[PDB]
Ligand binder design. Structure first.
Ligand SMILES: Cc1cc(N)c(C[n+]2csc(CCOP(=O)(O)OP(=O)([O-])O)c2C)cn1
Ligand SMILES: Cc1cc(N)c(C[n+]2csc(CCOP(=O)(O)OP(=O)([O-])O)c2C)cn1
Ligand SMILES: [Ca+2]
Ligand SMILES: [Ca+2]
Lengths: 678, 678
């Protein structure tokens, strides 16, 4: 039963979201205005503690259409989160806590949203991380895990293929605690949805295995909106999409036009709206005390009792189940196990040539049981990526007979972008989740809308990107990366590790997992590389290091991944002709850059020529090397030795370019590419 | 009526594709072995001329599952395209015309495929381009355009977001002549589909507005296949999917296994099935004369006849409708209207400061009338990208009441990756189709899959990417690009234009439209920007040119887009403190690198410090400058002028940095970054 106050609370939500777009004189007013009744209804039955945004068993809410953020900040403020009328009064302004799109980093904001289709896929990830936490820790007597994931979305989310990718996997996985409400407002920026989008969302969703409930009058039916979510909570075997019809910009004079989508309302239109709802038209940012009181009583005071009772059960649990409680309290404290690192593989040069892809499989094989928070998967390339450790159980519904939700290995399908954002949501659940997803380095590019947000929000997810170069061979240029590393190296905040040998793969994993805020891509060879003489975990961990040194080098050859051994061989040729080369192995541009300049300048000093060697785009390399031997045209079908030799990446071919670099600069003093003037 | 030579033809297609894989000792047998019945039936009834692959009214066929190439290469050889047994004997080998994934460049090969979901989405662009051309030029008594677009696709393209995006748009647009045939083989790489893919595909595509037909015995039932293709052609208002079930690896000793997907069949397995199919175990790449003979009568000689009749109808068209005939003939010679460039705008430092986005809108107003083949759109951003001319008509079905199929403005919905692939389809069709579509520069990264293939194939599509930086402002970080141009400047064969003004936008559109092999991205400003005294279409067409010069510069300032203006202001300020700065505008790194070195070196000479100015990542600028002022962190929400000011991008902020560059280097001799050792 809802009452007068529920209706005064919905009016307050509607107008506070309108005073905030108008004062910023920038923003989108229309979806706040029409979704306001369901935000009131939903939020009021979420179990969450506004004083503790981090409580692991809090029901979690995603705004997949994050352009509607004025409603989120209104709810956050009104139900007792740390966001004030003053914060609200500096929406979209430089330096505020109120950006024009939700950012993961604020209290009460789960993920960063605003690219469409990204929120819904993030929330699927979250529903997967819950299902797994429950099956791993919940003991009879101790339901530590059971929260729902609530997602608000629009037409725009539903047109983006990532949502499709995501909803198919979610229907496959039978994720019944994910409840999605969709704003069936019939508008997007260009006009009526019918002008492009006129399909059958409900029949398309039932083909995935989701339940579709409908709310025909989303503008005023609080009781139907409430009944749908009630009913939805019973479909435990299938997720729910609730198709809810609303008028965009409800209450506005131009409500239902695409004009209310993304500009502030006209003064005159905001004044009538206020009167219309019984608010004074000349007063901004007004919150009725009965409203503050309502939410205190219905949401914040219950929630703090809920988080209290959950703690008492968890302290009991740890007495009863010591091992499991210690493990879980560690995941919650965000610690990796003490000296987990010791289980990592070290190698010598007597050991054999292995592609860094097999070596990968062996770190996984040697640390999964160390790290129960590690959950992994492949986008249909498990045999090519070698992402399954042998004793693994698949993350599936128990109904499947292929696994169950205690399993820690997911089969993502040929769905790369969706894997990006599901791992970003699994990471985002907490309980120190460490997701890693495998695919081929060229098709990480299929997942760039997700991969970018891992950097921006700071979600420390791992992509095990095998088949890094023309080493791929016969499959040819549709499958051979050129511009890939160069792209991700231009994106702020992501490690891009291209390990050369066993000990360089173990430093890539060490740094990747110890990371709390920076994603990582590990680019791995298809082909066999030898064990370098000189690589340790410790020096590879500094991101870039001197693998072989000479006193007074004629040249410094800087190389990554498969090209470091070529440089060690090219250096062997050069010595024979009395040129002294130092060989610098540079495994991660990011970690390297984080070293002190004393160290970086010792690796790449002044007065020596530096020529870089890597079989991909040369563009990114001018910040370390003086000359660069790389590949700036697409690849070729051929046996991979034949493809490297075609392009000239042979010992003597590299050596020759080093000799031409020496000759070109002879009698010039040289300044390290590292030294910056401002 | 299918007889015994249809049965001989399906075993020859099968064992020929098997011998090709097994001799390359690399490749995918599975799908060629199961789809070979359907390749036979469909090609037998397709209207095409083997001896002329360019006939505009040819029935087109795309293998979206490009990994089954060997089926396609067998069919092209047998039906009389220029491809031979020796070509086939050189499959997946460096230098051959038979690469491991199909490539646009071969005759018979329509677009390159091998990334999943791309071939099917191209087919939709191709089907639109049929629809459009038929609506433009067909007259009563002159059906010059009436062909079908057939696709073959697997479960993996049905798992990719892009094909959902494209199918949703193809259903809305009602493209009844687009027939897709799904290889329902229950396998993919990891294993069976139930493991990840278990949705009702049929109910999903019906939800889009597609007609779904079913063939239950795709392994043997040639007549069933034939009847679905027939029923399908009757669907004049619905595109069709034929869900035809096969057995992966059919005929093999490991049929139905997933080890038959992408490895050569074992030697003895190859002998058991040649024997089973009544061929000799110990002979290979064997085509019975009767198959050659069969395809001669069934396909080559009829298609030649039909092409020839097309040519006579077209000569009479040119008599009857002389001006429309004239036009289609120009397009089919691939010529652009003589002296079209005259309608391109020019400005002087007199004219108002306009956003590059509005100047773009203006080039569209002046050229669409000149260029009948310019068909454009937006992925739900028409009022933001300003991509529609005022006298336009939307590309939509007759029934819509909102446009028709002769319309030249597509409403794509929020479907960026689909729009880039559909655009490749439109372009790849022929008749000088010049496609474009806009979005925000940041979300072109969502189409990165389709965009790489524009470059690999050479489909000269144009991206209109407005909102090129932090100049966006209050939407903030999720919408401001940092990495985007750096990435796309790392990719071979794509022009990444970033005009500073009127004249620079016109240079961008003429080079972009004159292009026959390179796609483009034009990065356009939201904010107003001043016309520059010195810019000219002639100069900006060279990709980089001296905009302001001095006799003996203390420093050269190289900027792009909105920072060229900033750099002129910085130059006034430096002049006052007596530093002489030459300011260089570099609108496209590509077009600039295409210049004679001799020219480039006059723009960027040795022995002057060069410093680059741009509000995006510095990592690509190492190839032209000594120091770089740019932004390598993500942006922020605030009034745009405050965000520029925040990052130091101010006239006096740029000048101070220019002075420190001068000061840092003073006394050293400096080599221009253009110069290489080898
Ligand atoms: C990937 C992507 C993310 C974006 N934010 C957009 C711009 N954008 C934001 S909302 C929208 C379309 C209208 O979206 P909606 O979900 O229907 O919202 P409503 O409030 O109903 O108008 C567009 C094109 C482009 N591209
Ligand atoms: C974008 C992209 C393109 C690729 N080629 C791959 C690898 N790939 C090729 S086929 C396939 C999985 C099987 O798909 P299918 O169409 O069902 O093929 P079939 O022969 O039926 O097993 C995958 C993962 C991943 N992702
Ligand atoms: Ca909408
Ligand atoms: Ca398959």
């Amino acid at each position: 039963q809802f009452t007068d106050i529920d209706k005064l609370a919905v009016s307050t939500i509607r107008i506070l979201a309108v005073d905030t777009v108008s004062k910023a004189n920038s923003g989108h007013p229309g979806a706040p205005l029409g979704m306001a009744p369901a935000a009131h209804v939903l939020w009021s039955q979420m179990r969450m503690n506004p004083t503790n945004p981090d409580w692991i068993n809090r029901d979690r809410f995603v705004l997949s259409n994050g352009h509607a953020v004025a409603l989120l900040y209104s709810m956050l403020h009104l139900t007792g989160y740390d966001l004030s009328i003053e914060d609200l009064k500096q929406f979209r302004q430089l330096g505020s806590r109120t950006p024009g799109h939700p950012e993961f980093e604020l209290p009460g904001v789960e993920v960063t949203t605003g690219p469409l289709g990204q929120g819904i896929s993030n929330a699927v990830g979250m529903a997967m991380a819950q299902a797994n936490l429950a099956a791993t820790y919940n003991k009879p007597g101790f339901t530590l895990s059971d929260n729902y994931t609530y997602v608000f979305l629009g037409d725009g989310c539903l047109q983006e293929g990532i949502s499709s990718e995501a909803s198919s996997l979610a229907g496959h996985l039978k994720l019944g605690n994910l409840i999605a409400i969709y704003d069936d407002n019939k508008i997007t920026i260009d006009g009526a949805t019918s002008i492009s989008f006129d399909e059958d969302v409900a029949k398309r969703y039932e083909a995935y295995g989701w339940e579709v409930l409908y709310v025909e009058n989303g503008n005023e039916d609080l009781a139907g909106i409430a009944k749908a979510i009630a009913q939805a909570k019973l479909s435990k075997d299938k997720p729910t999409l609730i198709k809810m019809t609303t008028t965009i910009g409800y209450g506005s004079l131009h409500a239902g036009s695409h004009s209310v989508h993304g500009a502030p309302l006209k003064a005159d239109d905001v004044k009538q709206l206020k009167s219309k709802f019984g608010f004074n038209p000349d007063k901004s940012f007004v919150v009725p005390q009965e409203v503050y009181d309502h939410y205190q009583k219905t949401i914040l005071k219950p929630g703090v009792e809920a988080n209290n009772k959950w703690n008492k059960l968890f302290s009991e649990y740890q007495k009863k189940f010591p091992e499991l409680g210690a493990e879980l309290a560690r995941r919650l404290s965000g610690q990796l196990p003490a000296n987990w690192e010791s289980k990592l593989p070290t190698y010598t040069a007597k050991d054999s040539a292995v592609a860094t892809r097999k070596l990968s499989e062996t770190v996984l094989e040697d640390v999964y049981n160390q790290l129960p928070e590690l959950i992994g998967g492949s986008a249909d390339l498990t045999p090519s990526n070698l992402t399954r450790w042998k004793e693994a159980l698949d993350f599936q519904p128990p109904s499947s007979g292929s696994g169950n939700y205690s399993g820690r290995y997911i089969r993502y399908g040929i769905r790369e972008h969706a894997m990006g954002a599901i791992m970003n949501g699994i990471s985002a659940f907490g309980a120190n989740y460490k997701p890693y997803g495998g695919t081929f380095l060229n098709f990480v590019s299929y997942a760039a809308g997700a991969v970018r947000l891992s950097a921006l929000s700071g979600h420390p997810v791992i992509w095990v990107a095998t088949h890094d170069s023309i080493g791929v061979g016969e499959d040819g240029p549709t499958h051979q990366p050129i511009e890939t590393l160069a792209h991700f190296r231009s994106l702020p905040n992501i490690q891009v590790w291209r390990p050369a040998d066993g000990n360089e793969v173990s430093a890539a994993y060490k740094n990747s997992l110890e990371s709390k805020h920076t994603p990582s891509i590990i680019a791995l060879s298809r082909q066999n590389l030898p064990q370098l003489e000189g690589s340790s975990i410790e020096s590879a961990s500094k991101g870039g290091y001197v693998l072989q040194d000479v006193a007074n080098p004629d040249i410094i050859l800087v190389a990554t991944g498969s090209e470091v051994s070529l440089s060690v061989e090219a250096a062997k040729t050069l010595a024979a002709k009395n040129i002294k080369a130092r060989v610098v192995s540079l495994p991660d541009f990011f970690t390297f850059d984080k070293q002190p300049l004393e160290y970086r300048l010792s690796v790449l000093p002044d007065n020596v020529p530096i020529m870089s060697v890597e079989v991909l785009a040369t563009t990114c390399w001018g910040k370390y090397a003086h000359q660069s031997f790389g590949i700036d045209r697409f690849g070729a079908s051929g046996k991979a030795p034949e493809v490297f030799k075609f392009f000239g990446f042979t010992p003597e071919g590299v050596a020759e370019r080093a000799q031409k670099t020496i000759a070109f600069y002879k009698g010039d003093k040289l300044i390290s590419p590292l030294k910056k003037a401002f």
